[PDB]
A paper describes a structure:
The rapid spread of the severe acute respiratory syndrome coronavirus 2 (SARS-CoV-2) B.1.1.529 (Omicron) variant and its resistance to neutralization by vaccinee and convalescent sera are driving a search for monoclonal antibodies with potent neutralization. Mutations altered 16% of the B.1.1.529 RBD surface, clustered on an RBD ridge overlapping the angiotensin-converting enzyme 2 (ACE2)–binding surface and reduced binding of most antibodies. The RBD is a major target for neutralizing antibodies in both convalescents and vaccinees.
Binding involves all light chain CDRs and only CDR H3 of the heavy chain and buries a total of 805 Å2 interface area from the antibody (left). (Left) CDR H3 and all light-chain CDRs that are involved in binding of RBD. The light chain CDRs are in marine purple blue, marine blue, and blue for CDR L1, CDR L2, and CDR L3, respectively. (Left and inset) Even though both antibodies target similar regions on RBD, different approaching angles caused a clash between LY-CoV555 CDR H3 and B.1.1.529 substitution R493.
Author numbering:
A (entry chain L): 1 to 216
B (entry chain H): 1 to 231
C (entry chain B): 332 to 526
The structure:
Amino acid sequence: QTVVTQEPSFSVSPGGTVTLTCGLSSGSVSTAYFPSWYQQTPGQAPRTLIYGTNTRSSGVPDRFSGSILGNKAALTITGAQADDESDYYCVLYMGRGIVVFGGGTKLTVLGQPKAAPSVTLFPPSSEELQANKATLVCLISDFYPGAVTVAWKADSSPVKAGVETTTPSKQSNNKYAASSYLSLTPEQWKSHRSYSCQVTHEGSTVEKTVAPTECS
Amino acid sequence: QVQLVESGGGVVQPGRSLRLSCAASGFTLSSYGMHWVRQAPGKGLEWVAVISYDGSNKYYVDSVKGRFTISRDNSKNTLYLQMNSLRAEDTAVYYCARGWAYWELLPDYYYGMDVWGQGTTVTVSSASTKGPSVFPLAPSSKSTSGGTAALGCLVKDYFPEPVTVSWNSGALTSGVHTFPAVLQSSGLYSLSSVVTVPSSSLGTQTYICNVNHKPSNTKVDKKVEPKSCDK
Amino acid sequence: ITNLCPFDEVFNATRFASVYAWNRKRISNCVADYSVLYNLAPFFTFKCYGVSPTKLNDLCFTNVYADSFVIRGDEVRQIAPGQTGNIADYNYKLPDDFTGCVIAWNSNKLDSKVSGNYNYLYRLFRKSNLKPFERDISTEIYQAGNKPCNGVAGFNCYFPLRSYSFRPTYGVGHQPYRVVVLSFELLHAPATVCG
Ligand SMILES: *[C@@H]1O[C@H](CO)[C@@H](O)[C@H](O)[C@H]1NC(C)=O
């Protein structure tokens, strides 16, 4: 497919120099057509950085720069700060009416205050139980980063079907919060002695357990 | 001078045409071309269509040949984003861009995205105006055995999205945080918002979860108070 | 009528284009006088073909065509009637029986950048020769060794277009020279410009 490249993520400390590169599966960056890199804001309007090699944009801080370096197009920024904690899109114009984008490269700065996730699991109330439906919510908040995978188990066997996950979102005080959903039958819910919810954060295991008989 | 106003978003059953507009003010969009792009929820945004000298070209993606058409209004200074026979494959908050100039080389459509934001949300689903199911969230004493207690209200089977959810009619916002919804197994939506309040507030304050589904204009003021499980 | 012909935008020329998009224009019915076109800045080439510059204004014509674009400084001597070169076969060209004038001069003050104004591009590959006065808007991938790649632009198949830098810290041959081409025709209506 014409989809070109996007690195997953890159790491750098603030106050220094960070580079960023997006190569070509075709391998022809020498096309010299407009390379343009774009900011991203999760949930609101992004803006512009560069349109054409190093052609600078308007109303921009000078610290940013970028050019075709090596055989593959790249970027390089110095004096990094918390102004834009998000990924970016490098765009090349090929096709005479064809546009190629990328999935984004999740640049994460490492100089930040760090905390551990907060987990609360609430079993369904009886009023929803009488509705012939059952759904448990195990919420996770106050964590950074959001690279957490949630797995849920009835009794002691994790179950993959019937599980939905939520991507973490930024909080007011610069940290992440998420949750997940599982909708099974109350008949199935009451057939297990206990239920467990587990979340791992950078390899740190947090556990929460609920008991159906307590609500009975 | 470069302000944009858009309308025509919403949610409807698949297979019917939809009309959406990107009206411009402060400069004549008929002066020269522009473009627009869509962004999937969570998944990365990808290009859809570009326009031309306002009479020259109608380039589209290869994915929409034979099913899409673009239109403009020079006298009223707007372009029509005609959307025929919705398919579930297209669901985004797509918004229109800006590129006017008159003096440049033309090996491409050039003048990429420069001003974005403040647009319209369009969602397609195999659903209709189906009443939300509202439920309270009353924790037990164990998790409230601390400085702060958490209260919430569940939102179920609400269509079309979104549904206005708030707490105490907007008077109380301390500790109020809303969590995004997900697609269910049956393709439905459901979410919850939890309000964290100090334990020196239970009982004295009236905690009420209001929910309004605008297309049906159904009103539910769910009373959320801790369970009185005196057993 | 001794009114000014609109030659201001031709010379001071706010901005320009590339070689393949050689910026065709049409103007007529004015008053022509090239005393304004006389030497004013250090000029590197005023060697124009078949016409006496002195008698440009006394004898006047119809249907004047005047265009301009950017060219690498080394090749400025290669644009001639019946003259070889890759520009002749793969870019804008000129036929043998050419009657018109032409000017060349370097532009290093505004066309230079700390890295080079990479806006300007050129076409490097086509199928065959070109007829005079033609604009090529082809964008399909050009094949090298048969077996067309169908948009891959990879091995054994090259993209027809390329571009080069304009770094000021170069030699004379790399300096960007702004060039203007003048052409016309005789036709059969009363004259349109002179005076
Ligand atoms: C270009 O501008 C200068 C300064 O305004 C002027 O002296 C010169 O005559 C102009 N060139 C023309 C009119 O060809």
